[PDB]
């Protein structure tokens with residue numbers, strides 16, 4: 001456990017500086033102060049190490065969103081959506097290396113693709129349930145199917161946050177991405193059509 | 194040229210059935226009715242073949258959008274945005290195998306990442322110029338910076354169309370994705386805040 005956490009911290013450090021393809025099991029064992037065979041006790045592969053790093057970051061974001069859902073919802077509609085989107089901005093934004101490599105690996109790894117898909121379904125279904133509540137209370141108009149709207153807005157957040165964090169071209173500057181997403185969620189949820 | 198087009202058609206056919214990683218230069222030469230060394234005359238690699246397939250599809254979408262921009266803009270604002278988004282829905286939707294492999298390769302290939310980035314900058318800048326025109330004429334309110342709004346809506350279309358075409362979970366059904374994107378573009382462009 002000592003040593004497991006030591007391997008994980010070494011992988012997150014090395015991913016800040018190069019891809020997983022460029023990090024060797026030997027690099028990971030060296031950093032964690034264990035032998036290579038001792039590494040293979042804790043993790044079947046460097047790929048299994050990334051999968052565990054991603055699982056921790058995804059669960060941290062999920063647990064923060066549940067925390068927010070526990071307490072009452074803000075009496076200001078725009079602020080209620082900003083606070084929830086900010087959970088993802090801060091959590092993944094605090095773990096950009098893990099995030100970047102995580103997204104790369106989804107094309108590679110069925111396990112990584114499956115983890116990402118399970119969490120996105122959970123977050124889309126929660127988004128859809130809040131839009132349905134807003135429509136029930138008379139605050140939001142009955143336009144698009146709620147689940148479809150929730151799907152597109154969640155995919156937009158995924159691609160846009162990732163582009164900002166990786167500093168891709170094109171991308172919204174990190175300092176502008178929360179305002180930009182909140183504007184699009186609010187106008188599309190409350191907007192008549 | 195005969196033979197180049199024959200290699201390209203074979204690669205698009207084989208990509209419908211498996212990834213590029215699972216297609217051999219020998220597979221491509223076999224399909225096009227040439228020898229392996231004759232293949233290496235036309236293309237340095239199977240990767241170079243994908244890059245050429247993607248370039249043709251991207252240019253087809255770009256040339257269709259220029260066609261639409263040539264003719265006057267529809268007197269119905271919602272229809273003007275649907276027609277333009279539909280260019281991307283139909284073009285990439287007619288070449289799903291190339292699209293799917295194209296997106297996979299961006300993590301792999303600097304050349305593929307660079308081609309995709311050049312076209313997205315062009316499409317975002319055109320989107321931003323139409324929003325600016327709409328604001329100038331008094332039709333759209335001056336909310337978010339136009340280029341930032343254009344960036345987020347274009348990234349949303351990228352991730353959402355690709356998820357629908359690859360049938361990922363989660364995804365908007367292909368039969369619902371155009372209505373869903375148009376709703377979000379229109380409410381976010383014309384929506385007061």
Ligand SMILES: Cc1cccc(CC(=O)NCc2cc(O)n3nc(C4CCOCC4)cc3n2)c1
Pocket residue numbers: 065068080081083084085088089092099119120123124126127130154155157158159160161162
């Ligand atoms: C309050 C409230 C009420 C209702 C719903 C929410 C949830 C919310 O608002 N946003 C959800 C959300 C969902 C996602 O699937 N993602 N995915 C990302 C990517 C993760 C890391 O790569 C880049 C971004 C962000 C994100 N956000 C909140």
Ligand SMILES: Cc1cccc(CC(=O)NCc2cc(O)n3nc(C4CCOCC4)cc3n2)c1
Pocket residue numbers: 258261273274276277278281282285292312313316317319320323347348350351352353354355
């Ligand atoms: C009329 C008018 C006035 C102003 C602007 C437009 C342009 C428009 O409306 N949409 C642009 C647009 C841009 C993109 O960068 N993409 N990227 C995709 C992905 C391509 C293949 O992978 C999945 C989708 C679609 C797309 N669309 C049109």
